[PDB]
């Protein structure tokens, strides 16, 4: 009786949300950006090849200096690279070799990683002993760690396969805020430029906007047909792009509260592992299971280039803070640095 | 062209390459085993004899080091992490023979053996385990022998029309799991009949892993 009434009220609220989105859908991003010139053909060369990982690489993250990057591989090694000289700065042995994600602190003093052990491990890179040591091990997730991103030296937000996201206080080792509402395994998260909001994509084919300080879900975004594997914020923080297993990329607007554009092609049927914008946000770069990385025009939904240099699935990619280069990781155990030429 | 500090940073990088090379050589000589199976299939018995999110057990048998990974606690989507074990030496799958006339506690409509067969089919034919050999442990053979005297095997398999004896009922069940192998050329299935008191299970794994090691060496050497 009471349960029957409530589930009908939820349907009415969903219809109200759907009708409100259609009310503000006066135009389309394709119609607005129809008269602008296309970006042409985007050609990038493999400037560097980072060798040293002996197993499939699952995650990479650029440092804020646009020169150092950390990569996580199944060989149990967390390696920090000097992208200018291909020199290995550190090689961190992991206690669990099943790492799925890695993060680089914006200060550069810490890196994080986590995998099938349900632990987010913080590593101190600046020690008087000259080595890298575990500073914290964050426990409390009941599923695998899928993504993690530092907000500062003391706060980090993690996504887990237990359908929850958590905000951790690294000093005390306790999660201050738990983000619940996803019905599927959360696979990716992306902090906003101001680090006051973050978006996460889960296996329920939905993306949710979260308030970090308030600790509640603000907006929920749907449209994908399968699990969302990747998510990334637009440079201005008013939009984000998702990468799903349905071989599509979609752009959502926070203020419009609805999907703006879909990035799919008939020749693409494989899932999407990673997504990232360029510095200006005009180019959307997505990694795929077909061993390639496609460069998309964010405003026109036109494929502008292909980064085909990997012999296995492109598991991760990232763009530097200055937009100078893009690094792609892959299951062939190689990282490649790409940029264009005049 | 490098400066004094640039040269010493390159020397440090090659020192790191030396340890990464050394760790890979040590890793390649270790046996990685993935332990799978349904609930109450005797997986815990296998770990006890051969003694978070993933439980990892190390043991050495006849100068060979094994790494057995249990993923029974991962209540998440299997397809989101089952590719992390692509490249293991072999998969150990545990099936309880006595759980043929029983039904699932949660479902109460599907037989326990059918659940194990469905789980076996989803793992053996998985795209990440195309060439991964499977060590099939058929557990609880002593309890199965007692059960088969009273409860006929026809409850689990209606098409079964053999003698109601352990020597024949167990063989029919073994053929059902091995018939689920959709790739009978790229992989082999090693079936063993363990027990609650059987002390020859670790020997079987060593023999089965040795055959896998030989097969990998033949592929590496180019003979295969």
């Amino acid at each position, epitope marked *: 009786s009471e349960l029957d009434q409530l589930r009908q009220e939820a349907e009415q609220l969903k219809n109200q949300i759907r009708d409100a989105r259609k009310a503000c859908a006066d135009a389309t991003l394709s119609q607005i950006t129809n008269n602008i010139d296309p970006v042409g053909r985007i050609q990038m060369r493999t400037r560097r090849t980072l060798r040293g990982h002996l197993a499939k690489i699952y995650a990479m993250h650029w440092g804020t200096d646009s020169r*150092l990057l950390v990569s996580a591989s199944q060989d149990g090694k967390l390696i920090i690279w000097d992208s200018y000289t291909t020199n290995k700065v550190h090689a961190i042995p992991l206690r669990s070799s099943w790492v799925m994600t890695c993060a680089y602190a914006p200060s550069g003093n810490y890196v994080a990683c986590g995998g099938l052990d349900n632990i987010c491990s913080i590593y101190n890179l600046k020690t008087r*002993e*000259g080595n890298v040591r575990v500073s914290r091990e964050l426990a409390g997730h009941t599923g695998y760690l899928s993504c993690c991103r530092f907000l500062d030296d003391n706060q980090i937000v993690t996504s887990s396969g237990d359908t929850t996201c958590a905000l951790w206080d690294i000093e005390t080792g306790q999660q201050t805020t738990t983000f619940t509402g996803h019905t599927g395994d959360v696979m990716s998260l992306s902090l906003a430029p101001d680090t006051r909001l973050f978006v996460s994509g889960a296996c329920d084919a939905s993306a949710k906007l979260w308030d970090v300080r308030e600790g509640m879900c603000r907006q929920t975004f749907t449209g994908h047909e399968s699990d969302i594997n990747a998510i990334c914020f637009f440079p201005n923080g008013n939009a984000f792009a998702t990468g799903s297993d349905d071989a599509t990329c979609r752009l959502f607007d926070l203020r419009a509260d609805q999907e703006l554009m879909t990035y799919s092609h008939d020749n693409i049927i494989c899932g999407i592992t990673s997504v990232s914008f360029s510095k200006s946000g005009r180019l959307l770069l997505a990694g795929y299971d077909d061993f390639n990385c496609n460069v998309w025009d964010a405003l026109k939904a036109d494929r502008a280039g292909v980064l085909a240099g990997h012999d296995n699935r492109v598991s991760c990619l990232g763009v530097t803070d200055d937009g100078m280069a893009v690094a792609t990781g892959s299951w062939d155990s190689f990282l490649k640095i790409w940029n264009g030429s005049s | 062209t490098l*400066s*004094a500090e*640039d040269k010493a*940073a390159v020397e440090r990088s090659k*020192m790191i390459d030396r340890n990464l090379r050394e760790d890979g050589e040590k890793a390649a000589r270790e046996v990685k085993l993935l332990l799978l199976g349904a609930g109450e299939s005797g997986k815990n018995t296998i770990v006890k004899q051969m003694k978070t999110g993933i439980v990892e057990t190390h043991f050495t048998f006849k100068d060979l080091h094994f790494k057995m990974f249990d993923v029974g606690a991962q209540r998440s989507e299997r397809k989101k992490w089952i590719h992390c074990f692509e490249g293991v030496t072999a998969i150990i799958f545990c099936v309880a023979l006595s759980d043929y006339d029983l039904v699932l506690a949660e479902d109460e409509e599907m037989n326990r053996m059918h659940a194990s067969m469905k789980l076996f089919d989803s793992i053996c034919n998985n795209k990440w385990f195309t060439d991964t050999s499977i060590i099939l442990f058929l557990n609880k053979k002593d309890l199965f022998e007692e059960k088969i005297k009273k409860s006929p095997l026809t409850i689990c398999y209606p098409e079964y029309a053999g003698s109601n004896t352990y020597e024949e009922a167990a063989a029919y069940i073994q053929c059902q799991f091995e018939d689920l192998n959709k790739r009978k050329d790229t992989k082999e299935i090693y079936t063993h009949f363990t027990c609650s008191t059987d002390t020859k299970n670790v020997q079987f794994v060593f023999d089965a892993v040795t055959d896998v090691i030989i097969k990998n060496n033949l592929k590496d050497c180019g003979l295969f």
Partner: single-chain antibody
Amino acid sequence: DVQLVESGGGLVQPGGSRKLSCSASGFAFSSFGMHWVRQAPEKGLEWVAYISSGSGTIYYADTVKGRFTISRDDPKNTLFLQMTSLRSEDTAMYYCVRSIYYYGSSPFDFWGQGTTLTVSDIVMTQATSSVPVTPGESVSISCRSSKSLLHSNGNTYLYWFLQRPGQSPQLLIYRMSNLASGVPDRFSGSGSGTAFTLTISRLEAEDVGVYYCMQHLEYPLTFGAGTKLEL
């Protein structure tokens, strides 16, 4: 805690042989490249030898090459300096210095107490030997180099060391601009090309000492004459 202890000094006859040892503790000794730097009585800092991490690269000063031998024992965390055919010019306080070399690292960050041994090329110039200073008054110390220390990679390899009276030298500024860990922000490093300046804001009593500038652009490593600040 990081600690380097030197032993093996003492009075020796000319042409003799003496063994110096450096006991390392509190840090990953095998990951650090080790240096020997000596200081003659009432003189400046003179780099002697360097052994890289893993003992793959070894450098010697021209005045000690063929006579001094440097070696390390990573399992025992010990650094050695085998000295033969000792001259009266070798009478100096020998320091054990650790330096680690990667991108963004701070070499020469820690110095040992030093052992006294008694025996019975880019030019770095510090024209001002002594500067009379008062507490709370800003002080600038200048250094010069014959060759430009700026490299094509963008790094200017100049280091600033403060040696308080009766203590080992301590790193202040590495690569001409970066403040060493634990050094107050009132120390700043400025310069370009061949001229460099070390500026101190609100000088205190602990800032009294001799300030040395060293170049790390290429071996051999050379120090300045040392500018002394006195109350």
